[PDB]
Design an enzyme around this catalytic site. Structure first.
Site: not given
Length: 159
Positions: A93-94
């Site tokens: 998750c970025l």
């Protein structure tokens, strides 16, 4: 000629020309053994020197669709890391990997892998994908750092 595959071949060519040492980024072998799958890459990220993850090598896949460079690849750590921003699935998750946030089509594989490496050392408090490391990171950093360091040892390349 897909525009995704056209771009991916260029990315690979550029990657071979110049890439950070200790990183790896290759097409994955197809299960039938006949050649490589340009739409699914197998990557490796070294823990950043001086950080909690130092000493480790972290295998990750990048899966692209025909919509790519418009839509980002999905990046998943093959073995899940103890990290607030890595889902239990291994998925990263970025914000630059989110087409509704900071993904832009010019972003390269090198930039993604360095971005993820940086993420490992610098968790993001607002997108907690994994409850316990997020909890520990906020409230018991000493305990977090010991679990992460222990894990870094687990991911040391075989020898």
């Amino acid at each position: 000629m897909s525009i995704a595959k056209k771009r991916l071949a260029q990315e690979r060519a550029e990657w071979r020309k110049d890439h950070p040492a200790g990183f790896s980024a290759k097409y994955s072998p197809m299960s039938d053994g006949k050649g490589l799958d340009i739409m699914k890459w197998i990557c490796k990220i070294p823990g950043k020197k001086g950080g909690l993850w130092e000493g480790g090598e972290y295998p990750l896949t990048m899966e692209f669709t025909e919509d790519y460079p418009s839509k980002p690849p999905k990046c998943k750590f093959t073995t899940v890391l103890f990290h607030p921003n890595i889902y239990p699935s291994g998925t990263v998750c970025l914000s630059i990997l989110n087409e509704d946030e900071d993904w832009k089509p010019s972003i390269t594989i090198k930039q993604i892998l360095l971005g993820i490496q940086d993420l490992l050392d610098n968790p993001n408090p607002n997108s907690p994908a994994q409850a316990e490391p997020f909890l520990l990171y906020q409230q018991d950093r000493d305990s977090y750092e010991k679990k992460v360091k222990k894990q870094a040892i687990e991911f040391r390349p075989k020898d």
